């Protein structure tokens, strides 16, 4: 066989230990999911420093905690805008997930609170910026570099899927790099708890699995498709399916055809053909052997999964970091003051926040 006795026993034992870790992690998540924390700080505890990113809901600001001096990333959501944008459920869901999960590559919600106008989620500040920026700058990552990041996503999805969470929002724009060079996942508005199927059209065109495009009921395998797209983009510098307009992207996605740069290793192409598999009965991560088909693939043969989880692997790239509060890895944005109305807006909608 492919493994002698020692290697097979070691792998079996490792896979059983994963099961044991995940069963405990589910116990812990379900406790926090049923009894969420709330109202653990307030706005005048923080000085606002700089906008790190903006979206249709509001924005994320670098803030400094006045007493501790600690920097954080504060997501500010305009309640009236959230309601107009039809995002009440997503917003409440994101906060509920963030307060309940616990994994080294998932951003930690340190405080949350609300006032008459806005919702606030105060997260650890991840100073390295988006993977997207580094990928476009460097061009493409080497296969060892791409693999170091990919392994973290595999483990994070293994974790999330054990909690019946489908992630659905994977792309380099949504992965931050921390001071040690490891990945942080921050966005959970599109994540959903579901043990079976779900049907919402959501995601980013380049990263959509065919069964989403085709308006099918779908499951957590769409995350493994998205991992395939991410690994391809990290290693190529561009995604596997692109075009001028989304409709053309979708035609390519559903076609069952993918082409690879000549510099891709055969091991990499083999993994990507099994992740970017239009046929759900054949897609890695969706088979009887589950995530083990991915973790045990030749392209990951040099990956020490436990060492990645323990953050004991030396990162291939450490972002520049001039000190706490350094924002140089983030873009510059127009700074709009934040107002709280004298009149509470949208109170009932957000009582759970």
């Amino acid at each position: 066989g492919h493994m002698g006795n020692a290697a097979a026993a070691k792998k079996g034992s490792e896979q059983e230990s994963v099961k044991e870790f995940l069963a405990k992690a589910k116990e812990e998540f379900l406790k926090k999911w049923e009894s969420p924390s709330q109202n653990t700080a307030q706005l005048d505890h923080f000085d606002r420093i700089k906008t790190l990113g903006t979206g249709s809901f509001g924005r994320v600001m670098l803030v400094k905690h006045k007493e501790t001096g600690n920097h954080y990333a504060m997501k500010i959501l305009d309640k009236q805008k959230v309601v107009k944008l039809k995002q009440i459920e997503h917003t409440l869901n994101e906060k509920r997930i963030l307060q309940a999960v616990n994994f080294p590559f998932l951003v930690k919600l340190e405080f949350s609170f609300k006032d008459n106008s806005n919702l606030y989620m105060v997260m650890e500040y991840v100073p390295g910026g988006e993977m997207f920026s580094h990928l476009r700058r460097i061009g493409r990552f080497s296969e060892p570099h791409a693999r170091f990041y990919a392994a973290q996503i595999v483990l994070t999805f293994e974790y999330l899927h054990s909690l019946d969470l489908i992630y659905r929002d994977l792309k380099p724009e949504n992965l931050l790099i921390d001071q040690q060079g490891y990945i942080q996942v921050t966005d959970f508005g599109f994540a959903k708890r579901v043990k079976g199927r779900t049907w919402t059209l959501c995601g980013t065109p380049e990263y959509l699995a065919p069964e989403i495009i085709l308006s099918k009921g779908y499951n957590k395998a769409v995350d493994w498709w998205a991992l395939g797209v991410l690994i391809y983009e990290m290693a190529a510098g561009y995604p596997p399916f692109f075009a001028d307009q989304p409709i053309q992207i979708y035609e390519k996605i559903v076609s069952g055809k993918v082409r690879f740069p000549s510099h891709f290793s055969s091991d990499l192409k083999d993994l990507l053909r099994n992740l970017l598999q239009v046929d759900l009965t054949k897609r890695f991560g969706n088979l009887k052997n589950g995530v083990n088909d991915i973790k045990n693939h030749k392209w990951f043969a040099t990956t020490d999964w436990i060492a990645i989880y323990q953050r004991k692997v030396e990162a291939p790239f450490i972002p520049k970091f001039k000190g706490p509060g350094d924002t140089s890895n983030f873009d510059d944005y127009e700074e709009e003051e934040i107002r709280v109305s004298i009149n509470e807006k949208c109170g009932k909608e957000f009582t759970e926040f």
Binding site: K171, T204, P205, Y238, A243, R259
Partner: peptide
């Protein structure tokens, strides 16, 4: 080249979700 096609697509910047 494929890279040139990627540049030509106009989708080299940050990509929005369907939302």
């Amino acid at each position: 080249t494929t890279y040139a096609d990627f540049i030509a697509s106009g989708r080299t910047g940050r990509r929005n979700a369907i939302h």
